[PDB]
Amino acid sequence: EKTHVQLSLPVLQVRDVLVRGFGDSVEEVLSEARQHLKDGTCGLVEVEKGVLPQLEQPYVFIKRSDAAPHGHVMVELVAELEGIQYGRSGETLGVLVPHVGEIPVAYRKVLLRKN
Ligand SMILES: CNCc1ccc(-c2cccs2)cc1
Questions:
Q1: Which of 51, 66, 83, 96 has the most crowded Cβ, counting Cβ within 10 A?
Q2: Quick one: CA torsion of 112, 39, 54, 30, rounded to 10 degrees?
Q3: Is the CB of 38 under 6 A from ligand 1?
Q4: Could you tell me where this protein is found in the cell?
Q5: Three-class secondary structure of residue 12 per DSSP
């Protein structure tokens, strides 16, 4: 199990997302996010004004962890619940959500730390 894995994540528009979060506690959302990333069933929503209030907390963000092998920006997971974050990292790339067949607008290449 390598420390990092290259993934191409489907980028979803928030209004298309059918399942708006991964669960109900910080530990669950991180766990489920990781399982969906493993299974190829995880999408990414880019954060713009109006996005977060349309998604369910706790949130799972991917944040930049370094400073980009082979096109894939190195990232790690950080969860947020009620204004508190669980992890510290760099800039947010987006919020992770389950992917259940929505049509993406792009794919985002990342090198994800499995931590
Ligand atoms: C290439 N697809 C295989 C694979 C994908 C993702 C992961 C994980 C992501 C986060 C924790 S495990 C592991 C294996």
A1: 96
A2: -60
A3: yes
A4: Host cytoplasm
A5: coil
The first and second tokens of residue 44, run together, are 């990414």
3-state secondary structure 73-112: EEEEEEEEECCEEECCCCCEEEEEEECCCCCCCEEEEEEE
Amino acid at 98: P
Per the listing, tokens 């109006």 go with 50
What does the chain come to in residues?
115
Does the beta carbon of 5 lie inside 6 Å of ligand 1?
yes
As a whole number of angstroms, the distance between CA 33 and CA 38 comes to: 9
Structure determination method: X-ray
Q: Is the CB of 37 under 6 A from ligand 1?
A: yes
Residue 79 CB less than 6 A away from ligand 1? no
In whole angstroms, give the CA distance from residue 8 to residue 54.
24
Nearest CA to ligand 1 atom 2: 38
